[PDB]
């Protein structure tokens, strides 16, 4: 979990989703890629 | 790091930075990075931006730096009281008004140029925008 | 690709059909490229460049050019299929070629429908002018 101010799609498999009013990158392929805005 | 070779005067008044810019259009290149925000680019900052963009363009196509840091900014040394004359010149700025084409570029595909400009932009203190060559 | 190019392609297809009466089918629902290449080369060996396998059997592509010539070909549409227009010679022997190809590893995709030239059935016709 990379908590950042800027969250970005790092690959094709990265998807940006909003969960309970928090922007999140979740990725099916790469576990490293998953992010959270904080 | 850009700086005037010679100067008429070693120090300078603060002044104000109000108004719109004059170097507004893409003149030389095909694409430009136009300043949307008001502020002041230091020489250092400009250089950084140039470095960012050249690398991005991989030494292919020409770059112009439409801005020049011709105004010296003084800083008083630390732990020194308020009197006793003006501080020494530390760094040089270009005062930037909205509308200022900061950088110009040609001999590049458009997307790549855009990318380069974006890369540059993060190095600069002011909010900026990509612009193109306009007939008239 | 834009509308014009598609239209042109359709026109070309129509012209090809007009030129050649006999036709046959093939399908790549599990087909190697090498085999296809070889098949193509066979055509070249035989006669001119004219013949293409023309994979464009959509509901409104080849089926839209079907009302021009050979009107029964509209029902062939809703399946993965590839046509083969045959210009020179009255009833050539490229129909059984496809069957042979199928036999040599293709896993029965086209089901050799025939394209009906003398109003033929689903089963093969070995009886052909030689």
């Amino acid at each position: 979990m990379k908590v950042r101010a800027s969250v970005k799609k790092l690959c094709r498999n990265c998807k940006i989703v909003k969960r309970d009013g928090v922007i999140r990158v979740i990725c099916s392929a790469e576990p490293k890629h998953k992010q959270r805005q904080g | 790091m850009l700086q005037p070779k010679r100067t008429k005067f070693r120090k300078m008044h603060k002044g104000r930075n109000r108004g719109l810019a004059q170097g507004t259009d893409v003149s030389f290149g095909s694409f430009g990075l136009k300043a949307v925000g008001r502020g002041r680019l230091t020489a250092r900052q400009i250089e950084a931006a140039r470095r960012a963009m050249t690398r991005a363009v991989k030494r292919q196509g020409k770059i112009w730096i439409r801005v020049f840091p011709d105004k010296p900014i003084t800083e008083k040394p630390l732990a020194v009281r308020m009197g006793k004359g003006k501080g020494n010149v530390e760094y040089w700025v270009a005062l930037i008004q909205p509308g200022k084409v900061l950088y110009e570029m040609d001999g590049v595909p458009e997307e790549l140029a855009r990318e380069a400009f974006k890369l540059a932009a993060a190095k600069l203190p002011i909010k900026t925008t990509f612009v193109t060559k306009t007939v008239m | 690709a834009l509308n014009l190019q598609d239209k042109q392609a359709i026109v070309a297809e129509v012209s090809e059909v007009a030129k050649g009466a006999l036709s046959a089918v093939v399908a790549d629902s599990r087909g190697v490229t090498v085999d296809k290449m070889t098949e193509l080369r066979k055509a070249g060996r035989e006669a001119g460049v004219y013949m293409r396998v023309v994979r464009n059997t959509l509901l409104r592509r080849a089926v839209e050019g079907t009302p021009f010539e050979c009107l029964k070909d509209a029902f062939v549409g809703p399946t993965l299929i590839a046509y083969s227009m045959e210009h020179p010679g009255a009833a050539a022997r490229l129909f059984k070629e496809f069957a042979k190809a199928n036999a040599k590893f293709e896993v029965k995709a086209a089901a050799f429908e025939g394209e009906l030239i003398p109003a033929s059935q689903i089963d093969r016709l070995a009886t052909l002018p030689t």
Binding site: - | - | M37, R41, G44, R45
Partner: protein
Amino acid sequence: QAYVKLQVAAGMANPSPPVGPALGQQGVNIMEFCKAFNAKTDSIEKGLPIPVVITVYADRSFTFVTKTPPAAVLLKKAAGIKSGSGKPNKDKVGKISRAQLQEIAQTKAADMTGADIEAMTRSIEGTARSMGLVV
């Protein structure tokens, strides 16, 4: 079934240094492949590499079908040069005529995928260009 093209020159019987574990990765022995290669060789020419299909069956006795020798080596031979790739557009190392390329094309026709020899010629020209030699 375990088919891979990996071999050096035809004259070099039993490729020990370059191929090595690659040829004898599967159940088939070292000596057999080499013998097969030798058998293939005597009909045509030595010195050049020749690729062959390696269908490793469960019975060990593999089926093999030969291919035409690589184009690059042939091109090199035609040229009379050994190295001509280092900075090609900066400075032209070697040069070939179209006729020679055409001649080269015709001999390989069996393995080349196509009917038109002109096509083959142009492919060969492209290959040459890629290598570094200007037509």
